[PDB]
DNA sequence: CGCCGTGTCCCTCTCCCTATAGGTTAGACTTTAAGTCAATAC
């Protein structure tokens, strides 16, 4: 499922390159580790191929995913619990889960808030984190040059 | 059965974010004490 040279997508660190299919044994059991590295954190992670789907290493958003998160970002009628703390903990869990639809919903919701209401620097920071991981996801999904991913993302938020 | 000396030991002294309500100050307007000039008389 995850061969060498594959630009495979791992949560939460986005896309990553696999270097080799490592045969590092433990307890005399030659498990099929794979070395995978990302470009942001500059870290290398070894994952066994058996429980590779347990960690949920995904595949990059294609076209249906792009228009799906598009429709979510343009989805109207979204409203939140009145107490800001419930909204905060809900969308914190929602970003911690890390799926593209819910990250898109988080960023579009907070952008709709930020347009008029405004949020705290911590809440701006939570946005900025979700926006950063989302624009990395899109810029390696359409393979479209992070700066241009930011400019298209700003194009689409206005609708 | 009922109280008293000796010994040992412990201790002390010295050399997050939100919402409401209320107080504070800074900033400008009109008044006043203040600085000024011109002519004059002895």
From Swiss-Prot:
Keywords: Virulence. It comes from the Bacteria. It holds the Pfam family CarD_C. Gene3D superfamilies: 2.40.10.170, CarD-like, C-terminal domain. The keyword Cytoplasm does not apply. One of its GO terms (biological process) is rRNA transcription. The keyword Disulfide bond does not apply. Controls rRNA transcription by binding to the RNA polymerase (RNAP). Required for replication and persistence during infection of mice. This is RNA polymerase-binding transcription factor CarD. It comes from Mycobacterium tuberculosis (strain CDC 1551 / Oshkosh). The gene is carD.
